[PDB]
Design an enzyme around this catalytic site. Structure first.
Site: not given
Lengths: 330, 6
Positions: A199, A35
């Site tokens: 991004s 995770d």
């Protein structure tokens, strides 16, 4: 020192991916959910409330000769899921893919929420975010990755998640074999304790690329792609019949529809998620309504590049003293 | 689906 372990989806939807890990002496092998958006190594165990374990494999610390109670020490964690887990804490020897770490904090579940109990394929989580997020009290512990770093050939792991298929997690090296072209590295902000990056924009299908900065976290522990409401609305506008459902809680589309691909930007490079990745199948058994893989971030507070985006790429988590995130095509 | 410490 390096380590490779094969990671395997838990169902035909790729909701999650499990990796075998060796805990204890002699080894007890449990299937953990790697995770990168939490920081706790926690396992189902001989202390877990018996009405709260199903057919999970449990960790029995009294059968390990390396296992030692961390006296007074204690954990509690909560997820975006609404998922919960808590208990007490051992140190023990943990092995992943032949990479061994001794005196790892293994946090032993006394309690576990219903969502975990009904998931028989996941025996616990291995957190690989930054250690500041670790939940153990009164003394905070370090993650497996942090404990390995120094021993590693490079202080790096890669994630190579499969679409409907196994993948690999490597530690201490980059399989130049595993991706196509160049790796594009991009800056990571550690301030919140996530693999947080930014991004450079997006395209939908064969559409123009819109340069816009999208900040979010690389999270192998999230199924779906969570993006701002603007972005997510532009994607589903291109799918006839798609609509945001108040009943089901996200965008659904008629199962017989073709899903355009989704492109996102890392620096000057672009990762395309084929539209097939974005199909998460009938919202209910028999329905002709299918659940979409790109959903709105508006109610989280943070955008998440979960497994829908990561399994389209070869992903490097560079845990150097200025960490970076690399993406390549595969 | 799952969403791991948010």
């Amino acid at each position: 020192s390096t380590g490779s372990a094969t990671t395997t989806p838990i169902d035909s939807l790729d909701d999650a991916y499990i990796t075998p890990v060796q805990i204890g002496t002699p080894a007890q092998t449990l299937n953990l959910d790697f995770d990168t958006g939490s920081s706790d190594l926690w396992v189902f165990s001989s202390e877990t409330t018996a009405s709260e374990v199903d057919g999970q494999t449990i960790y029995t610390p009294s059968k390990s000769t390396t296992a030692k109670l961390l006296s007074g020490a204690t954990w509690s964690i909560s997820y975006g899921d609404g998922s919960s887990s808590s208990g007490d804490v051992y140190t023990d020897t943990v092995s992943v893919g032949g990479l061994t770490v001794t005196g790892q904090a293994v946090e032993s579940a006394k309690k576990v929420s219903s969502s975990f109990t009904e998931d028989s394929t996941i025996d616990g989580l291995l957190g690989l975010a930054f250690s500041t997020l670790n939940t153990v009290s009164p003394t905070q512990q370090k993650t497996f990755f942090d404990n390995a770093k120094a021993s590693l050939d490079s202080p790096v792991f890669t994630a190579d998640l499969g679409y409907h298929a196994p993948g690999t997690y490597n530690f201490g090296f980059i399989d130049t074999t595993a991706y196509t072209g160049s790796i594009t590295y991009t800056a990571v902000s550690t301030k919140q304790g996530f693999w947080e990056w930014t991004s450079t924009g997006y395209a939908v299908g064969s559409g123009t690329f819109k340069s816009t900065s999208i900040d979010g976290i690389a999270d192998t522990g999230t199924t779906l792609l969570y993006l701002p409401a603007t972005v997510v609305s532009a994607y589903w506008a291109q799918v006839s019949g798609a609509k945001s459902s108040s009943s089901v809680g996200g965008y659904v589309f008629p199962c017989s529809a073709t899903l355009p691909s989704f492109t996102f930007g890392v620096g000057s490079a672009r990762i395309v998620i084929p539209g097939d990745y974005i199909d998460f199948g009938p919202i209910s058994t028999g329905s002709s309504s299918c659940f979409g893989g790109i959903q709105s971030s508006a109610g989280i507070g943070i955008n998440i590049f979960g497994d829908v985006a990561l399994k389209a790429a070869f992903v490097v988590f560079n845990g150097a003293t200025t960490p970076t995130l690399g993406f390549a095509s595969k | 689906p799952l969403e791991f410490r948010l």
